[PDB]
Design a protein around this nucleic acid. Structure first.
Lengths: 80, 129, 121
RNA sequence: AACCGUAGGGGAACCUGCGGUUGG
RNA sequence: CCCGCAGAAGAAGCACCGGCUAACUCCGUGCCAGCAGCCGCGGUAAUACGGAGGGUGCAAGCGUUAAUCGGAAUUACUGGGCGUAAAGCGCACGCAGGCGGUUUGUUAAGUCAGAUGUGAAAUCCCCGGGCUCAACCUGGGAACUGCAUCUGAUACUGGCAAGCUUGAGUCUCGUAGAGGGGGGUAGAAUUCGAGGAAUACCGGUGGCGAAGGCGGCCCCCUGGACGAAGACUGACGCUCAGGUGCGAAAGCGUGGGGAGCAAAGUAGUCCACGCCGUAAACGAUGUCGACUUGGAGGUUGUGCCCUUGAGGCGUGGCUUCCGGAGCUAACGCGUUAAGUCGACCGCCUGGGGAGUAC
RNA sequence: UAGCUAGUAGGUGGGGUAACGGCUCACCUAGGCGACGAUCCCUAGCUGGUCUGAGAGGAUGACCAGCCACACUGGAACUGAGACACGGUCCAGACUCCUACGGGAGGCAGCAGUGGGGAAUAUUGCACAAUGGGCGCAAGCCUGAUGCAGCCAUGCCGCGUG
């Protein structure tokens, strides 16, 4: 498939689009401590098949809109 | 301790060496037993024994050659908050190879020499010298 | 400090203040010598002084000690200040090279000659 | 006795009241 | 690039000389002329000013000044400190963050090993080659400390679920105490029967409270601490930037009160509410947890001891004094650390200008 | 500098580009970014590298090489495979020049120079013989790119002054 970064759906308020935050563990460039860092990505899904709090797997595709270049392929878990 | 048990074990060993004690006790754990095995292999302690069933109490038997103790310097390297992971060719040599550096690799808790020979590195635990 | 206190707020550097803030990275500057003084020093010393007062081409006006053993500076002559703050009298943190624009090398010098505009005999 | 916080007063350091400290 | 002829023929200067720093004596001057990177020289024998001689360093260059780094461990991740030198918020509660006691299984994100792509050439480094050497040019290699994908390893950290009790918390029984608030009440004393304020002895190196702080007796409501044996929940824990709350004394606003004291004998000191809330708010020592020889003494809980006694033996809680190892520059701390380690936060970087202006 | 943004964030429909896309339009939903530093103010071309340092680090981006931006200032467009174009055109403004006073021509941040600013930085030189580019079927033509020369101890290295 693709890199298939996995994140957590932060907010689902737009129409046919969601916001997903991925996680990253990176060492500090000079102090050597493993800081937690997140990145936000607009993800586009047509069926509205997720909920706020889920964990999804997003892959990269052609740019669909301004600051929206990811698509949802599968939802792993549910809200609760 | 409450947030780092390995530092508590090392502090107990160091204080026992300071006060000329003969045996120290502490709550046991698999990692502590592995560290005690590594210490007794290189020869920094006489022996060690574990007792109990539901709340074990690991007990060492500190050994001193002469009036001066054997374990003269021991510290915690990768303390919780500053985790340290070193590769194969970056493994440290304490006291120009006269001491040991207890590392934790994918095979088991072993000294730095065995890890350098086998060809793999991992999380450093403590410097013993 | 704790590693977190440095991750959040890093180790700030120590800013440096230049001793001569009118040269602005220039080993020489041209003056006009607006006035000449002979004011007294502050620490116990056996002299009055030999100083001047020039207006640099970049607007700043700074004092400038005059070394040697006798000068020929006027109120409309141009000088070439270099640096080298003078300790005794406060407020003077420059010098005046000799034999550059309108100054002259003090006479009879035969040791440490190149420091003044004195040619070889 | 000094100092601190505060308030008032006085050419000026400062004086006085209230509370605290021993850096009496 | 090579060869030939006169003639050693044309080719050496700059800075310093008291210490730091290699290299000394005499003359002119007498706190004057002056030198100076710092310490600093002279008011009549200058190794420091000017000149001569002498040696010292570099050399077709030598010195001065601007600029960066080093020395500067002098912003310390490698690599520092906060009792007295600059530094521990006035305290408690706590969101977001930082960190996680013990055992099994699973996942493989962190971590580790190998491989495959890429990390432009020159530069830097190693082995060589050529300009009469060197600077310079150049062949091969190494390195480019980095990034992504794939195949594996499972001890540690992280995710998911099931667990255990020592961390943590609840219940029962009691103990002590100026813990807080409300309202009554008593005596002494002062002032002029009236009125206000504070509670002599008990009283203490005493007690309570997170701090500021809290004194007659009784009544009511309520908070916290401690001790002994059980059960239960089963990590529910520690710290905390912003944030909320509490917070001597003085002062401000409203309405009262005013005996004594007392700024300027008035305000005030007293009361209700509201604001300000700052201090030498001090132990000049943040909170939590673990470990490390002893002796003197207060208070309190409980168990035990012909409990026959004022009593004796422990074991706990809180709290004074002297000291060992250890720490520190010293004073001193010293199981209630300023000792050995771990987790988290604020603050410190010469003095004044200044906790000043904007 | 603690709040920012209303073609702003999303959705169907047209329109447009070589191409995806709010780049643009009409309608609807009311969102999107921000303490892990949004918006705002000052400064600044970026990198391979250079200097320093035992190392981690610190300071800068001279020459050489890659990328981006501008061509007197501001804006739009045509030709073309490629430009919103250094020595191409048009529009508005200040500058310098010619003038028969009606109107017109220019852009050395190309090499060499002049005036000015500054402590300071050079010749109005030779050639296409080599490398490279444009046109040409090839000779060949153009090439201030380039190869050399001229000035300055500015730096590195070597020799001499017996």
């Amino acid at each position: 498939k693709i890199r298939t970064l996995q994140g957590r759906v932060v907010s689902d308020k737009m129409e046919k689009s969601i916001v997903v935050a991925i996680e990253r563990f990176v060492k500090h460039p000079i102090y050597g401590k493993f800081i937690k860092r997140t990145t936000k990505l607009h993800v586009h899904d047509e069926n509205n098949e997720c909920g706020i709090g889920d964990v999804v797997e997003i892959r990269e595709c052609r740019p669909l809109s301004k600051t929206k270049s990811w698509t949802l392929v599968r939802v792993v878990e549910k809200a609760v | 301790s409450m947030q780092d048990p390995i530092a508590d074990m090392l502090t107990r060993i160091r204080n026992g060496q300071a006060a000329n004690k003969a045996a120290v006790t502490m709550p046991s754990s698999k990692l502590k037993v592995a560290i005690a095995n590594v210490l007794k292999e290189e020869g920094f302690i006489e022996d060690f024994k574990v007792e109990g069933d539901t709340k074990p109490e690991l007990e060492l038997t500190l050994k001193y050659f002469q009036g001066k103790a054997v374990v003269e310097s021991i510290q915690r390297v990768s303390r919780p908050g500053l985790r340290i992971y070193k590769r194969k060719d970056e493994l440290p040599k304490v006291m120009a190879g006269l001491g040991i550096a207890v590392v934790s690799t994918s095979k088991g808790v072993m000294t730095d020499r065995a890890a350098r020979q086998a060809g793999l590195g991992g999380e450093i635990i403590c410097y013993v010298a | 400090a704790t590693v977190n206190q440095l991750v959040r707020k890093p180790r700030a550097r120590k800013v440096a203040k230049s001793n001569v803030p009118a040269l602005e990275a220039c080993p020489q500057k041209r003056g006009v010598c607006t006035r000449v003084y002979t004011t007294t020093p502050k620490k116990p010393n056996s002299a009055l002084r030999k100083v001047c007062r020039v207006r640099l081409t970049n607007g700043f006006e700074v004092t400038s000690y005059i070394g040697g053993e006798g000068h020929n500076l006027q109120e409309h002559s141009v000088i070439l200040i270099r640096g080298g703050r003078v300790k005794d009298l406060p407020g003077v943190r420059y010098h005046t090279v000799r034999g550059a624009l309108d100054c002259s090398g003090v006479k009879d010098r035969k040791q440490a000659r190149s420091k003044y505009g004195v040619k070889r005999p």
